[PDB]
Amino acid sequence: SPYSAAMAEQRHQEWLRFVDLLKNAYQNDLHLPLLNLMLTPDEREALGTRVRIVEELLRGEMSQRELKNELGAGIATITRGSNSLKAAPVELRQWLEEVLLKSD
Amino acid sequence: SPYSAAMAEQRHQEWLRFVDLLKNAYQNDLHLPLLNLMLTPDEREALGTRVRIVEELLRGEMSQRELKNELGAGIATITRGSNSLKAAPVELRQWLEEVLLKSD
Ligand SMILES: N[C@@H](Cc1c[nH]c2ccccc12)C(=O)O
Ligand SMILES: N[C@@H](Cc1c[nH]c2ccccc12)C(=O)O
Ligand code: NA
Numbered sequence: 001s002p003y004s005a006a007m008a009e010q011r012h013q014e015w016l017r018f019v020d021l022l023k024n025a026y027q028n029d030l031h032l033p034l035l036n037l038m039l040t041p042d043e044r045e046a047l048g049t050r051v052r053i054v055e056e057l058l059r060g061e062m063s064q065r066e067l068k069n070e071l072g073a074g075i076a077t078i079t080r081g082s083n084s085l086k087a088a089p090v091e092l093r094q095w096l097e098e099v100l101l102k103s104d
Numbered sequence: 105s106p107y108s109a110a111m112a113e114q115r116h117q118e119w120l121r122f123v124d125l126l127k128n129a130y131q132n133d134l135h136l137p138l139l140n141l142m143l144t145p146d147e148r149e150a151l152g153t154r155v156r157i158v159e160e161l162l163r164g165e166m167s168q169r170e171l172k173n174e175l176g177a178g179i180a181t182i183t184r185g186s187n188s189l190k191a192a193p194v195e196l197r198q199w200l201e202e203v204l205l206k207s208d
């Protein structure tokens with residue numbers, strides 16, 4: 001079937017419902033049980049790996065091929081990361097540099 | 105290779121790093137860009153669907169087969185949801201009932 005702006009609107013509301021639910025879970029200290037409920041073990045592992053990739057890409061010490069060898073992540077995975085980082089708002093990149101990199 | 109408690113410890117620290125990063129993103133109003141960076145479009149769609157499944161399972165109006173027919177989600181998916189809900193801390197279930205169900 002063709003793309004539907006109407007269906008896109010439904011998907012968008014459902015996504016924000018998750019975002020807002022998680023926001024409130026953090027406020028009540030229920031984020032860990034909520035994330036354990038909402039994600040699979042494999043998704044949780046993937047997110048932990050993705051943070052490492054973003055940190056190393058921001059750092060710029062390792063080449064992308066070195067990262068693949070070091071973390072076990074395939075090139076396709078690293079590329080998705082690199083492309084998403086390049087597409088992010090500058091303010092998010094600046095904040096990630098502040099929190100993920102050590103002062104120096 | 106055999107399971108390693110040492111590798112499990114590394115995975116656990118990486119997961120908490122994501123959890124804590126997201127916590128801080130919410131505090132700075134950078135959660136939307138962070139989630140857009142960290143998840144794929146398919147994962148975001150899956151999370152929106154999972155919230156709907158949990159809401160309908162808590163509500164108890166629809167049978168699991170009716171849910172499959174209504175939301176397009178396969179039985180395997182619904183079952184994972186049901187099993188994870190049954191395994192969650194009672195305090196999380198009680199909170200979900202309070203926020204996902206309408207007062208009545
Ligand atoms: N937003 C990314 C998600 C992603 C996949 N692999 C990654 C590796 C690192 C960081 C983010 C990612 C995407 O749609 O591709
Ligand atoms: N914690 C669940 C994640 C999950 C998969 N499918 C779901 C559907 C609804 C709610 C949660 C889920 C699991 O490991 O299976
Ligand atoms: Na690096």
Ligand code: NA
Nearest residue numbers: 160164165166
């Ligand atoms: Na229902």
